[PDB]
Every structure is written in structure tokens, then in C-alpha cells.
Coordinates of C-alpha atoms (C1' of nucleotides) in Angstrom, one line a residue:
Chain J
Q10 CA 121.9 466.6 -55.8
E11 CA 120.6 470.1 -55.1
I12 CA 119.5 469.2 -51.6
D13 CA 118.9 472.8 -50.4
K14 CA 116.7 474.1 -53.2
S15 CA 113.0 474.0 -52.4
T16 CA 112.0 474.7 -56.1
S17 CA 113.7 471.6 -57.6
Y18 CA 113.0 468.1 -58.8
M19 CA 114.5 466.2 -55.8
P20 CA 111.4 465.9 -53.4
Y21 CA 109.5 464.5 -56.3
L22 CA 112.1 461.8 -56.8
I23 CA 109.8 458.8 -57.1
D24 CA 106.6 460.0 -58.7
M25 CA 108.5 461.7 -61.5
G26 CA 110.1 458.4 -62.3
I27 CA 113.6 459.9 -61.9
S28 CA 114.7 457.0 -59.6
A29 CA 113.2 453.7 -58.4
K30 CA 115.3 453.2 -55.2
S31 CA 115.6 456.4 -53.3
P32 CA 118.9 456.8 -51.3
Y33 CA 117.1 458.8 -48.6
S34 CA 114.6 456.4 -47.1
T35 CA 114.5 454.5 -43.8
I36 CA 115.0 451.1 -45.6
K37 CA 118.0 452.4 -47.4
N38 CA 119.3 454.1 -44.2
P39 CA 118.3 452.2 -41.1
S40 CA 120.0 452.9 -37.8
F41 CA 120.3 456.6 -38.8
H42 CA 116.5 456.6 -38.4
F43 CA 117.0 455.0 -34.9
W44 CA 119.6 457.6 -34.1
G45 CA 118.1 461.1 -34.2
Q46 CA 114.6 459.8 -33.5
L47 CA 115.8 458.3 -30.2
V48 CA 117.7 461.5 -29.4
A49 CA 114.6 463.6 -30.1
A50 CA 112.4 461.3 -28.0
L51 CA 114.9 461.5 -25.2
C52 CA 114.8 465.3 -25.7
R53 CA 111.1 465.2 -25.0
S54 CA 109.5 465.5 -28.4
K55 CA 106.2 463.8 -29.1
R56 CA 106.7 463.2 -32.8
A57 CA 109.7 460.9 -32.3
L58 CA 107.8 458.7 -29.8
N59 CA 105.9 457.2 -32.7
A60 CA 108.8 456.5 -35.1
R61 CA 109.2 452.8 -35.9
Chain O
rU10 C1' 107.9 444.7 -54.6
rU11 C1' 108.0 449.3 -52.2
rU12 C1' 107.7 451.7 -47.7
rU13 C1' 107.8 453.3 -42.0
rU14 C1' 104.6 460.2 -36.9
rU15 C1' 97.3 455.3 -37.0
rU16 C1' 101.5 464.1 -39.3
rU17 C1' 100.2 467.7 -42.8
rU18 C1' 95.0 472.0 -48.3
rU19 C1' 96.8 477.0 -47.2
rU20 C1' 96.3 479.5 -42.9
rU21 C1' 96.5 479.6 -37.8
rU22 C1' 97.0 478.3 -32.1
rU23 C1' 92.7 481.1 -24.6
rU24 C1' 87.3 474.8 -26.1
rU25 C1' 89.1 484.6 -24.1
rU26 C1' 86.3 488.8 -25.2
rU27 C1' 79.4 493.7 -27.8
rU28 C1' 80.2 497.8 -24.4
rU29 C1' 80.1 498.1 -19.3
rU30 C1' 81.2 495.4 -15.1
rU31 C1' 82.5 492.1 -10.4
rU32 C1' 80.3 489.8 -2.2
rU33 C1' 75.4 483.9 -6.7
rU34 C1' 75.2 491.7 -0.1
rU35 C1' 71.6 495.2 0.9
rU36 C1' 63.6 498.6 1.3
rU37 C1' 64.0 500.6 6.2
rU38 C1' 64.6 498.4 10.6
rU39 C1' 66.8 494.8 13.4
rU40 C1' 70.0 490.2 15.4
rU41 C1' 69.1 483.6 21.5
rU42 C1' 65.1 479.7 15.2
rU43 C1' 64.5 483.2 24.6
rU44 C1' 60.4 484.5 27.4
rU45 C1' 52.0 484.9 29.6
rU46 C1' 52.6 484.4 34.8
rU47 C1' 55.6 480.9 38.4
rU48 C1' 57.9 477.2 38.5
rU49 C1' 62.4 473.2 37.8
rU50 C1' 64.1 464.5 39.9
rU51 C1' 60.0 463.1 32.5
rU52 C1' 60.2 461.6 42.6
rU53 C1' 56.3 460.3 46.0
rU54 C1' 48.7 457.5 48.5
rU55 C1' 50.4 455.1 53.2
rU56 C1' 53.3 451.0 53.4
rU57 C1' 57.3 448.6 51.9
rU58 C1' 62.5 446.4 49.4
rU59 C1' 66.4 438.5 47.0
rU60 C1' 61.3 439.5 39.9
rU61 C1' 63.6 434.0 47.7
rU62 C1' 60.8 430.2 50.5
rU63 C1' 54.4 424.6 51.7
rU64 C1' 57.3 420.7 54.1
rU65 C1' 61.3 417.8 52.7
rU66 C1' 65.4 417.6 50.0
rU67 C1' 70.2 418.6 46.5
rU68 C1' 75.3 414.0 40.6
rU69 C1' 69.1 416.8 35.0
rU70 C1' 73.8 408.8 39.1
rU71 C1' 72.3 403.9 39.6
rU72 C1' 67.6 396.8 38.2
rU73 C1' 71.7 393.2 38.6
rU74 C1' 75.6 392.6 35.7
rU75 C1' 79.3 394.7 33.0
rU76 C1' 83.2 398.4 30.2
rU77 C1' 88.1 398.5 22.5
rU78 C1' 80.5 401.9 19.4
rU79 C1' 87.5 394.4 18.8
rU80 C1' 87.2 389.5 16.9
rU81 C1' 83.8 383.0 12.3
rU82 C1' 88.6 380.9 10.6
rU83 C1' 92.4 382.5 7.6
rU84 C1' 95.0 387.1 6.1
rU85 C1' 97.4 392.1 5.3
rU86 C1' 100.7 397.1 -1.5
rU87 C1' 92.2 399.3 -2.2
rU88 C1' 100.4 395.3 -6.8
rU89 C1' 100.7 391.9 -10.6
rU90 C1' 98.3 387.4 -17.5
rU91 C1' 103.0 387.7 -20.3
rU92 C1' 105.6 391.7 -22.2
rU93 C1' 106.9 396.4 -21.6
rU94 C1' 107.9 402.1 -19.8
rU95 C1' 109.0 410.2 -23.5
rU96 C1' 100.2 410.4 -22.8
rU97 C1' 108.2 411.0 -28.9
rU98 C1' 108.7 410.1 -34.1
rU99 C1' 106.1 408.8 -42.2
rU100 C1' 110.0 411.6 -44.6
rU101 C1' 111.5 416.5 -44.6
rU102 C1' 111.7 420.6 -41.7
rU103 C1' 111.9 424.8 -37.4
rU104 C1' 110.4 433.8 -36.7
rU105 C1' 102.2 431.1 -35.7
rU106 C1' 108.7 436.8 -41.1
rU107 C1' 108.5 438.3 -46.1
rU108 C1' 105.3 440.3 -53.6

RNA sequence: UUUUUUUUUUUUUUUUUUUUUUUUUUUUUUUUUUUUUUUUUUUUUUUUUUUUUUUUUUUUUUUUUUUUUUUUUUUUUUUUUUUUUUUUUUUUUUUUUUU
């Protein structure tokens, strides 16, 4: 899926019309958005205190 | 439906900086916000010392009675028509959730 390439089509997945249901979202991947964000909030980061 | 930092142009990151500076010190003197002199109870005329007293008195007691600010008699849930007894219910439903 060329994840690592900054000059590629992946970050414009939706607006290019390549895919309609992205496999990288919070709705597609809940409870991995709770993990990680909870860890960062418990590691005293102010960004993760606002994650839903 | 889709989403999920009320994040983001790129840069940047002391609500720091001319240069020089650093007692919101200083004329020189000075240093009781002391002092004429001499005094020192914001004492005293002499008397005097209950903001006591006419005498008499001494419950801010009393006419005599009296002594529940009780009582017609009867009574004694400031109960009761009967019936009743979720200030429940159409049916279906049951996140004041959702493209």
C-alpha cells in the first residue's frame, strides 16, 4: 500500500476517489484509537487529552 | 451516509534586546521631626469628706369574703351515604442514539 512514501497517492485516498471506505480511520479501527491515545495521555501529552 | 485534537499556509518558538548601562543614592554640609530662660501632680482660698438624714416608719400586703383565668344537660377519632383503595393502564412500545 506504499505506506512509507510521502510522494504517493495514499494520503489522498478519499478525495481522489480511489476508495470509499478507508481502512485507516477511527470508525474502521476503534479501540486502537483508544489504545495509544490513552497511553500518550498517561505519558503527559496534551494532544491526546482531547481524543474522543 | 461519512467521520472523530472546538490541530495545522509555509516558516518559526523570551508577550528579550539601538549602543551604553544598573542603589526609582548623592551640591557642599550635616543627622533627637531636643532646647529662650527656669521649671515639672493637666494638686491646693480656708474649711471640709455616705452625690445619708424633718419627725415617724419599713411586704411598691390586705373592705369582708374567697382561691381549676372548671362545669346548662348530654358527650368524647376536628371517622363514616353506599361502594371502593398504584394521584397505573387505548393498542403498541422503551438510549429525551443514528442519513
